Each structure stands twice: as structure tokens, then as C-alpha cells.
């Protein structure tokens, strides 16, 4: 119950609605423009009716000496529009505002920066923010779910991202801040018509949360029986996905021309000459689809078939049953029965820390406890008549079997995969 101490507002999904489960009974009014789902996610758009109003229980008591409280929530911010970089970088918009008599707090966003602002009764202001890079090949934050926690005490305001301290601002100068006014969740500013934000698990505490307490809540809220996709949403059966490899982030799978194997190519990247932004393309390579062996949620330990689309037909990923080396090239072919190929894969999650990566274990039989190997990427010698050249191939490897047991789990292992479905928050026009 550690992560339930001092909680004074806990918004949770219930019957197609959002309700305060803090135990203090705050009134919550979600207007028709807010999209909600049973995974506790809610979307704020640019529509005028896309808003939530929370009226706090006025009997709640706050620290009278100094501002001693914390706010936490998960958020997913869409990628910038390539042809709208300037507005992205410059236009700041409020997403959550709690003001009373011109005093209070607010959470706002300017491009790739998330901002926390406090205004005391004298009108004095202070802010602290977290900005993520927008020039990396692959970002851990753009359009992906991440955990935010802001804490305030007598001396400073801190921002923790995914359980870790990222920013701090001294606020010893700030005097009384009125924090019990109405909370308005709504995009406010000069925003594009297509702008939107997803949020989840919004909570407020009347105390400064410790780093230990914050890291703990991160893990508890990251926990689920099901696997997640690249953006952090639940992984699904019967859904098209591109594949990403954590150990070779700039690599993607492509069916080799005239050969039933998967070769690994290099991800292309942003063309247009904008020194402000850089990224590698995500929607490339073969389109895969996970099928249940037996639209659902793919859970750890499930037995599946990893299929993909090859010219108007659904194909499948197989492993030869008798390769004699440590690792071998996977066989990518039509769906059919065979004596010499395994097609059953058990999807796993070996990491004990929050992750969006999963592993693919080929099984002889669902029943047999025998382990054939894990799917990964390996460099194969393609020695040609002239001289020997090498090339990476989509493979099965027995070497990962032992490595995945080492603790702490190695996040960079080549057997770590992520699934990327097309998402409205990530657009990559040529």
C-alpha cells in the first residue's frame, strides 16, 4: 500500500467513465470530446468539448508551511509534423491547469519539452521541465508511453521520468500556492487542429514522494500479464506490425530476393534538410502478424505463429529442425505442414524491469520442455567466387538461451524484439 499513502486524487476508469478513487470523493466531469478506454487511457484533442473538469474535496488539508505535494501520470506525446517543425518548437500549450485566485499549478507542453509551473499568491512564478532529444535514430520517448512524476517540497521542484530524476528547480523563493482549485484537463494554446495527447493514471499526493517510492510505483504501474508493442500499448493477435530489434536498432528485416530467408537491411532516415530533427524510419521491412496457436491481447508464455505478408499471401517464419551450427537462417515460406521445420514459437519476457521488448522461443512441441533456440540477428559468411563478404540474417540462435539467464537482463541482446504498428502519433512522409 506504499504507493497509496498520501494520495488525495486517483483518477481511474470505471463504466466508460473516469472516477476519483482516492477515497475523498472528488467530482469528475468528463465531456464528450474525451476518448476513454478500459486500459485507463484517455485522449485530449483540440475539440472544444475535449476536456475533463475535476472539482476537489475542499476539506482536504495541505501543508501550510510549504508546498509539499506530488503529481504523477503516464503520457504519450505524438511526434512532430515534419512540415510543421517551427510551430512544434515554439508553440506552448497547457494540458492540465489548476488555478485559484491566480495561484496554482499547471502542466504544459512546448514541442519536445514537458513543463511544470507554480504561481504563488504574490504572483511569483517558477518552472521545471523535461526535454527529450528529437535527433536520435530511435527515441525512447517520442509517441511512446512514459512515466512522469513531479514532486515539490520547501526547497525545490523535481521531475522524474520513468522513476529517475531528470530535472530540478529551486523554489525556496516561492511562498503560498493555492492548490485546491478546479483541475481542468484540456489542450489550451495555439495548437494545430490535429494535436492530441494520451494520458493514464493521473494521481495527486499531499506529500513529496521519495525516489524509492517513485521507482516502485513505476514498476507497479508498468506491470501487466500481457506483452506491449513498441509504443507501449498492449500487443495484439491479428494485427500488422513492423519488427524492431533492440540490439540492432537501425536494422530491419526484408525477404531476400529469390531466396526464402530474411536479410537485414539498414533503416533509411529523415531526408528533408531540417537541422532541427532527425530519426530513422519505423514503417519499413516486412509486415508481420501474430497468430494464436490453438483480435486478442498476446500474453507472456502464449504459443504463437509469427507470420508475415508476402505478395497477397500470408507466409510463416520457421526454423529448420536440424541445423547443426550454433545459429541458422530462419526459413520464411507459405503456411504448410512439414517434417523438417518447427513453426511454434513461445513468446517470452525475460527482463524483470519494465520493457517493451519481448523474446521469441522456438519450441519442438508446446508440451515438450525442449528449447530449440531464440530468434535474433546473426552475421553469415556469404563467401563468393571473388572474395568473401558477410551479411546479417534473420536467424535462430542457441547462444541466447544461456545469455537470457544472466542477471540483470541485458537490454541490448539481439534476441530482444519490439512490434511496431502504424500509429497516428507517428507520421513519416517521404
Amino acid at each position: 500500500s506504499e504507493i497509496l499513502n498520501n494520495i488525495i486524487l486517483n483518477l481511474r476508469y470505471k463504466d466508460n467513465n473516469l472516477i476519483d478513487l482516492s477515497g475523498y470523493g472528488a467530482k469528475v466531469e468528463v465531456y464528450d470530446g474525451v476518448e476513454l478506454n478500459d486500459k485507463n487511457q484517455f485522449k485530449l484533442t483540440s475539440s472544444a468539448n475535449s476536456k475533463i473538469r475535476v472539482t476537489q474535496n475542499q476539506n482536504i488539508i495541505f501543508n501550510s508551511v510549504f508546498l509539499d505535494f506530488s503529481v504523477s501520470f503516464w503520457i504519450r506525446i505524438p511526434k512532430y509534423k515534419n512540415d510543421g517543425i517551427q510551430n512544434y518548437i515554439h508553440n506552448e500549450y497547457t494540458i492540465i491547469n489548476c488555478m485559484k485566485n491566480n495561484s496554482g499549478w499547471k502542466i504544459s507542453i512546448r514541442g519536445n519539452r514537458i513543463i511544470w509551473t507554480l504561481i504563488d499568491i504574490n504572483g511569483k512564478t517558477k518552472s521545471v521541465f523535461f526535454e527529450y532529444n528529437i535527433r536520435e535514430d530511435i527515441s525512447e520517448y517520442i509517441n511512446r508511453w512514459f512515466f512522469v512524476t513531479i514532486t515539490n517540497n520547501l526547497n525545490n521542484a523535481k521531475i522524474y521520468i520513468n522513476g529517475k530524476l531528470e530535472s530540478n528547480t529551486d523554489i525556496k523563493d516561492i511562498r503560498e500556492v493555492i492548490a485546491n482549485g478546479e483541475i481542468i484537463f484540456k489542450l489550451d494554446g495555439d495548437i494545430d487542429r490535429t494535436q492530441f495527447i494520451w494520458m493514464k493514471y493521473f494521481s495527486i499526493f499531499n506529500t513529496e514522494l521519495s525516489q524509492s517510492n517513485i521507482e516502485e510505483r513505476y514498476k507497479i504501474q508498468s506491470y501487466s500479464e500481457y506483452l506491449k508493442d513498441f509504443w507501449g500499448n498492449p500487443l495484439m493477435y491479428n494485427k500488422e506490425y513492423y519488427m524492431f530489434n533492440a540490439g540492432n536498432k537501425n536494422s530491419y528485416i526484408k525477404l531476400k530476393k529469390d531466396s526464402p530467408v530474411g536479410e537485414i537491411l539498414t533503416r533509411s532516415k529523415y531526408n528533408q534538410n531540417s537541422k532541427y530533427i532527425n530519426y530513422r524510419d519505423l514503417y519499413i521491412g516486412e509486415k508481420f502478424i501474430i497468430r494464436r496457436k490453438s483480435d486478442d491481447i498476446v500474453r507472456k508464455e502464449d504459443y504463437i505463429y509469427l507470420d508475415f505478408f508476402n505478395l497477397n499471401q500470408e507466409w510463416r517464419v520457421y526454423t529448420y529442425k536440424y541445423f547443426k551450427k550454433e545459429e541458422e537462417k530462419l526459413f520464411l515460406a507459405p503456411i504448410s505442414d512439414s517434417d523438417e521445420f518447427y513453426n511454434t514459437i513461445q513468446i517470452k519476457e525475460y527482463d524483470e524491469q519494465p520493457t517493451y521488448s519481448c523474446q521469441l522461443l522456438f519450441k519442438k512441441d508446446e508440451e515438450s520442455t525442449d528449447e530449440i533456440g531464440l530468434i535474433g540477428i546473426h552475421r553469415f559468411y556469404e563467401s563468393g567466387i571473388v572474395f568473401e563478404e558477410y551479411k546479417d540474417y534473420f536467424c535462430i540462435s542457441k547462444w541466447y538461451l544461456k545469455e537470457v539467464k544472466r542477471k540483470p537482463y541485458n537490454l541490448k541482446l539481439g534476441c530482444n524484439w519490439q512490434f511496431i504498428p502504424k500509429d497516428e502519433g507517428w507520421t513519416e512522409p517521404p
Binding site: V261, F323, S338
Partner: peptide, 17 residues
């Protein structure tokens, strides 16, 4: 029918040599 068999052969050559 199943040319799955022909492919199986292109596979074996791809790994063999």
C-alpha cells in the same frame, strides 16, 4: 501442388553452401 517444397530446396542450398 505445394511449391512450399521447391522453396524448401532453395532454403537448403542457401544454408548448405
Amino acid at each position: 501442388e505445394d511449391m512450399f517444397a521447391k522453396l524448401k530446396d532453395k532454403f537448403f542450398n542457401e544454408i548448405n553452401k
